[PDB]
């Protein structure tokens, strides 16, 4: 399986720089060009530039020519996008991608998972994680609902898995809400059999990369 | 640059019905010398990167279900989903690689219509751990309902609240085409401790009268 894995989300001050990394694996690194594409709020996907992973030549969009640098490190099969003089329009999800690899031998298209960059002078804050315990007030049709409340973090995003990814059915991880304080909160819930709460263990795995938060909260009645 | 214009901006059909998405390029992306159209179609679901469906305007990528097909030449292109499945709810984007800069369309959001489903309503008091820290969040959960419109109201000691709650709704579910909604009421610990009854009252098309879910502190 060919893949691209990006670095974690960041917050950076206006006027500062951000550098996002893109680790390639599972294919011949030097054969293809890695593109950078961003997706800003309410806006179309926007191509920024490409680098040929072999010889390192680049082409940048006119929009970013003066502010972007794309590089690559072949010994670590990793590409990098640095964007300087950050501005409010630059808050966005940044993707690396092997766009439309259409050769005589191959046809594929691979994207990294995306890196959220927030341009802000506000400080990073990690969340508290609180259980949403199943109870008589959270049962419906032979199921029990339970969850985790991830409160008071900055910037986005938080990600949540259950039981290290082994529990996926019946999960809803909600979009975050913006609190008056400027901090975010989110909820993640799952519905499970009402009959086996005594024998099964449910743990929410919360990640907030900007604050180095990795929490595993067991949720019990 | 080559501007990519899609229509409609959104569409909703029932499961199994045909969905049609149009894309117009501001300049031709056809090359007569090789008879090719330099166009691709992508699917993207919230929180995920786009996935390639179609390239050279009409060649379906390996592994893509054959209910997806692309057609057109020159400036006018069509993505067809012949029989919409629940997992097809997503936004769809055209893309040109004829000229630099590479560009994408504005997207078409594809939605399922399905039968009315009333929400399952749950309430969660604050955890003792959170109360230890001086704040109390009460969570009201509305699970797996349709249509998306729903109203939550909070009552504390039977009094309607205003200004102390936030809510958000999910994207449409990829399996059962429903929505869910979470609302949080936040009080200081001191204020939480002065009241007995906490309740969320839910209005929705599937309910003939509002449902109230409550607990005593």
């Amino acid at each position: 399986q060919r893949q691209l894995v990006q670095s974690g989300a960041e917050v950076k001050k206006p006027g500062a720089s951000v550098k996002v990394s893109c680790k390639a694996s599972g294919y011949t690194f030097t054969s293809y060009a890695i593109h950078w594409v961003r997706q800003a709020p309410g806006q179309r996907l926007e191509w920024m530039g490409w680098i040929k992973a072999g010889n390192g030549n680049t082409r940048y969009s006119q929009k970013f020519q003066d502010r972007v640098t794309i590089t690559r490190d072949t010994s670590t099969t990793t590409a990098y996008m640095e964007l300087s003089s950050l501005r409010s329009e630059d808050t966005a999800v940044y993707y690396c991608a092997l766009l439309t690899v259409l050769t005589p031998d191959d046809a594929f298209d691979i994207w990294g998972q995306g890196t959220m960059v927030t341009v802000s002078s506000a400080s990073t804050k990690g969340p508290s994680v609180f259980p949403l315990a199943p109870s008589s007030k959270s049962t419906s049709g032979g199921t029990a609902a339970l969850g985790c409340l991830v409160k008071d973090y900055f910037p986005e995003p938080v990600t949540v898995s259950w039981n290290s990814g082994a529990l996926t059915s019946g999960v809803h991880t909600f979009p975050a809400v913006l609190q008056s304080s400027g901090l975010y909160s989110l909820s993640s819930v799952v519905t499970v059999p009402s009959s086996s709460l005594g024998t099964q263990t449910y743990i929410c795995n919360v990640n907030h990369k900007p604050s180095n938060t990795k929490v595993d909260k067991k949720v019990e009645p | 640059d080559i501007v990519m214009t899609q229509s409609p901006d959104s569409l909703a059909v029932s499961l199994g019905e045909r969905a049609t998405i149009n894309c117009k390029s501001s300049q031709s992306v056809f090359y007569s010398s090789n008879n090719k159209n330099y166009l691709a179609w992508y699917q993207q679901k919230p929180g995920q990167p786009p996935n390639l469906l179609i390239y050279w305007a009409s060649t379906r990528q390996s592994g893509v279900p054959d209910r997806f097909s692309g057609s057109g030449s020159g400036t006018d292109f069509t993505l067809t989903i012949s029989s919409l499945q629940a997992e097809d709810v997503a936004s769809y984007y055209c893309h040109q690689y004829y000229s630099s800069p590479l560009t994408f369309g504005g997207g078409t959001k594809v939605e399922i219509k399905r039968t009315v489903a009333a929400p399952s309503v749950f309430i969660f008091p604050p955890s003792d751990e959170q109360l230890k820290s001086g704040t109390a969040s009460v969570v009201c959960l509305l699970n797996n309902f349709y249509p998306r419109e729903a109203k939550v109201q909070w009552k504390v000691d039977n009094a309607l609240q205003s200004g102390n709650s936030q809510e958000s709704v999910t994207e449409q579910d990829s399996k059962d085409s429903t929505y869910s909604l979470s609302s949080t009421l936040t009080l200081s610990k001191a204020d939480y401790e002065k009241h007995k009854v906490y309740a969320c009252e839910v209005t929705h098309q599937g309910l003939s009268s509002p449902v109230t879910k409550s607990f005593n502190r």
Partner: peptide
């Protein structure tokens, strides 16, 4: 005409 350097990954003669 197409610009073959818009996306180096595309071989227009494959």
């Amino acid at each position: 005409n197409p610009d073959p350097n818009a996306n180096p990954n595309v071989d227009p003669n494959a």
